[PDB]
UniProtKB/Swiss-Prot annotation, chains A, B:
The M4 transmembrane segment mediates tetramerization and is required for cell surface expression. It is found in: Cell membrane; Postsynaptic cell membrane; Postsynaptic density membrane. This is Glutamate receptor 2. The chain holds residues 414 to 794 of 883 of the full protein. Disulfide bonds join C203-C258. It comes from Rattus norvegicus.
Amino acid sequence: KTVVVTTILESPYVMMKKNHEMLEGNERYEGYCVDLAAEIAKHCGFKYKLTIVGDGKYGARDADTKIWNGMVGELVYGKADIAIAPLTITLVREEVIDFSKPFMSLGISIMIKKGTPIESAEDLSKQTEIAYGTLDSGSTKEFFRRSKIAVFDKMWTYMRSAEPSVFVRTTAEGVARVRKSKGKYAYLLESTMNEYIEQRKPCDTMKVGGNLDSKGYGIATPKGSSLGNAVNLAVLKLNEQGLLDKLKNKWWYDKGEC
Amino acid sequence: KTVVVTTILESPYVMMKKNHEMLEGNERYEGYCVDLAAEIAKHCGFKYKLTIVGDGKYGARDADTKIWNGMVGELVYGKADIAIAPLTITLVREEVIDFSKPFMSLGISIMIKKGTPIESAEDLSKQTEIAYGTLDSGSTKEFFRRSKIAVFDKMWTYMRSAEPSVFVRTTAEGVARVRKSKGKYAYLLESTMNEYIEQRKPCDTMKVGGNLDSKGYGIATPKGSSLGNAVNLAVLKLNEQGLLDKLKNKWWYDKGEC
Ligand SMILES: [Zn+2]
Ligand SMILES: [Zn+2]
Ligand SMILES: [Zn+2]
């Protein structure tokens, strides 16, 4: 009956309301994906329950274990009926779960502490003084591990062997590392997140260079799910009506702090 | 058996080669979609025949008869097996045909002759000296027809009644009109085409303002096609391999003459 929605605590997509302690169920959260979930549910005609993914990961398949973790895993193993979050549409994932057409378009980008002598990925690859890494168990790390183009291959070679680890468990951890490393750490993350943080106090980070690739986020459902068709149509309908653009302006710029 | 591919003559997606008269079959054409078709046929392992859509349209539904025209129509009525072209993913089309995840991201944009006093959609809707229109039988015209946002709504009110007609049968017709109108005509087209034309002689046009929306082009197949699933995965694979970006640079800027 009630659709179990798996999501992730990633500002400004999903965040705890300041007074969540005195609220119940779905009312405890706020954000872009919370607003989107309510709309998808309205248009598809179903009641739902928002739940935060247990391991706090987006989703990747363990090499030897072969088990999927994160939100992808919750769907693969039947723990959730749908995932509404900044989950990237990728080949390896579409092989095991279904994705609606994208609700947000983005690409991998570079986040630096203001003043850092870095203007592009090629700049990062040709130097060694400034360390750089990505989020764990996600599409960004896989992008570099599989890239066959010179620059990115060079970047992966370095990142995979760097000590201490240059990878982080959460976006917040990567942003904090940039902010505290005095320009000696650069973070590779999706443009959407980079742009968001660039508008948050202390306004000490910035997105540099063009995006490394072009892709998008999609609402995911277990392969063969009966919700797939309607959800996809809802996303297209909502994008065409301007809701998605309205929602990004609401959570990114209307609330900018810089 | 050989897969019938429907496509449209639209530079730089599909164009007849300089020496096409001495060539046969698929060899007569070149372009982004020609390269994409070859890549997809190779990965999905099938033989194909490129055919140019009979009525030279992308695809819209006749409100009177409810009959689809253009490439969408050739798929809907079984005249073609797959469409590989700059065909926009939209709700009305998704209801009758299948689309792969996008192979290109874009948005509606404004094309002006260099020097015309226009920098945004809002600017066009506040004047009458400068006429403006869109392509017929496509997603762009539908966008304005179905827009409830103030500026675009006013723009449609003007366009749908304009006399002489401000709409055109082909992108080429719209571009030609902008160039010969001494700046009294602005053309609304997707950013992909706008950016392309901006890089071609006589280098007298330019894209102004940001995109009005965000969407993408998808490879289309008839509902319940056996090629659907595979093509979709092929597109994702190609994007992640960097091919799509490779092809974009090859046909847009490596050949740019401005
Ligand atoms: Zn609604
Ligand atoms: Zn290939
Ligand atoms: Zn008619």
